[PDB]
């Protein structure tokens, strides 16, 4: 794909600054765009939209085609009178998602109450018309979520044999039973999607390209495995005979047991890939360019015995990722896929990315711990440009957390490679803004940035710390945090390197 020569920021909206516990889909996520818009960004990264669960991970969702219930801005239902909103105490600058669940949801059940008693009838209508527009994925995960609070909570794989085999029977009582409780997860729904076609809309009238976020991997305790066990690794029972990960490295003599359902490809590709032209599908309804999580597993994956702890007794399988993606070009006849191709990678999936114009990434924070052989380092970008440079990923440490950890060599080196580049900086809350620089000078068409290294915040503000058990997908802005003078850098930067 031919990306313009831009720069753009990464926030997940959960994020925001704003009442109530979370960032939500309202008035401060506009606020944010304008922000963007007048710093000169035209790109907004998020990561995965979904629901979540324990652990609070955008990357193991409850469905793979949901939004997130509690991205929804309660605002607009209050002021319906649906219902009304108080602040048990939410903390500052941080998601506590225990106090966000025992409030959020009993409000968003509270809101429906108050829309079946006041909603209008063309309300009512809109949101029956939704339901009957996403109903190929709608029906399954209404009824999934339904059927949770009816088993205590249980993964669907554990529920009476009727329903985890999904009998007819079994299931139309179900939703029969449950109507209502149904009812109200699309309903859920329904106000999602909603809130960010509004906001889609608002981003695209300021010339803002917004760019998603789907994992290679689904879930296992998700409605669509549920529905559709046929397209996975499982056993009678409904659970995983074998998982993802990835084969022990120079760091992981255990390797990484991520612990997701792997697809049974065959399958997948005698019914052409239907599951995937749906993700495409959806993803493009939300999204302007989708990024996906650990592309290398088109080309091929680790499979990893379900029953063992460890990722060391595994194998490289192939996928058919070149069908696949030929597959996807017919359909929607481009591939508006951002690869996330990041760790060891072979030529063989650099072959699979570059066949269909998929850019790659670079992650500056990477690019000095060797020599000027670094492919991180600007001046090794392939010449094309196709690739997006970012200082750190979410799931790295900021930039200033980075730098004040990192290894003397590290330092030093990054500190000449920039002066080469004619980039120079006095104290450590600089480092974040010098970096960024280097990023706008390279020949890489997109150089997105978390707003944790404009704000130059230390580890504190880290999104995600891969291995520590709590605390992750937590940061947020305060109010005003993100001032005019924070988008006037960004813009003069922009400026200064051709990216306006
Ligand atoms: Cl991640
Ligand atoms: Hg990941």
Redesign the pocket.
């Known amino acids: 794909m031919e990306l313009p020569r831009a720069f753009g920021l990464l926030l997940h909206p959960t994020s925001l600054p704003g009442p109530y516990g979370v960032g939500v889909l309202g008035q401060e996520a506009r606020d944010f765009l304008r922000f963007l818009k007048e710093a000169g960004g035209r790109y907004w990264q998020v990561l995965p939209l979904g629901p979540t669960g324990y652990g609070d991970s955008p ?1 193991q969702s409850f469905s793979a085609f949901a939004g997130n219930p509690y991205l929804i801005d309660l605002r607009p239902l209050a002021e319906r009178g649906y219902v009304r909103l108080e602040d048990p105490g939410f903390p500052q600058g941080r998601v506590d998602y225990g106090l966000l669940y025992a409030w959020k949801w009993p409000a968003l059940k509270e809101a429906f109450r108050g829309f079946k008693e006041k909603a209008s009838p063309e309300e009512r209508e809109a949101f029956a018309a939704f339901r009957e527009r996403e109903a190929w994925w709608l029906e399954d995960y209404a009824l999934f979520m339904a059927l949770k609070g009816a088993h205590g909570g249980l993964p669907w794989n554990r529920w009476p044999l009727p329903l985890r085999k999904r009998e007819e029977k079994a299931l139309r009582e179900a939703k029969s039973a449950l109507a209502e409780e149904v009812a109200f997860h699309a309903f859920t729904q329904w106000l999602f999607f909603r809130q960010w076609g509004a906001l889609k809309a608002e981003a695209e009238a300021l010339g803002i390209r917004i760019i998603g976020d789907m994992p290679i991997f689904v879930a296992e305790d998700s409605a669509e495995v549920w529905a559709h066990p046929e397209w996975f690794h499982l056993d009678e029972e409904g659970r995983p005979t074998v998982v993802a990960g990835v084969p022990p490295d120079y760091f992981s003599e255990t390797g990484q047991r991520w612990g997701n359902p792997l697809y049974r490809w065959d399958v997948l590709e005698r019914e052409g890939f239907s599951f995937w032209i749906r993700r495409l599908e959806k993803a493009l309804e939300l999204f302007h360019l989708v990024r996906i ?1 650990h592309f290398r597993g088109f080309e091929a994956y680790w499979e990893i015995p379900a029953s063992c702890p460890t990722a060391v007794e595994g194998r490289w399988v192939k996928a058919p990722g070149e069908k696949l993606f030929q597959k996807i070009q017919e359909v929607f006849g481009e591939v508006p896929v951002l690869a996330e191709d990041l760790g060891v990678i072979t030529p063989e999936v650099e072959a699979l990315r570059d066949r269909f114009g998929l850019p790659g990434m670079k992650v500056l924070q990477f690019a000095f711990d060797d020599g000027m052989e670094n492919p991180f380092l600007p001046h090794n970008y392939p010449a094309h440009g196709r690739v997006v440079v970012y200082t750190g990923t ?2 790295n440490d900021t930039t200033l957390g980075w730098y004040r950890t990192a290894t003397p060599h590290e330092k030093a080196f990054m500190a000449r490679y920039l002066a080469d580049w004619g980039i120079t900086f006095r104290e450590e809350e600089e480092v974040p803004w010098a970096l960024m620089h280097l990023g706008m000078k390279s020949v890489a068409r997109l150089a997105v940035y978390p707003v944790q290294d404009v704000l130059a915040l230390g580890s504190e503000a880290r999104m ?1 710390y891969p291995g520590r058990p709590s605390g992750n997908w937590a940061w947020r802005l305060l109010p005003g945090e993100l001032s005019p003078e924070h988008g006037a850098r960004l813009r003069a930067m922009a400026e200064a390197t051709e990216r306006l």
Request: proline share 0%; aromatic share 20%.
């Open positions: 990357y999580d979410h799931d995600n």
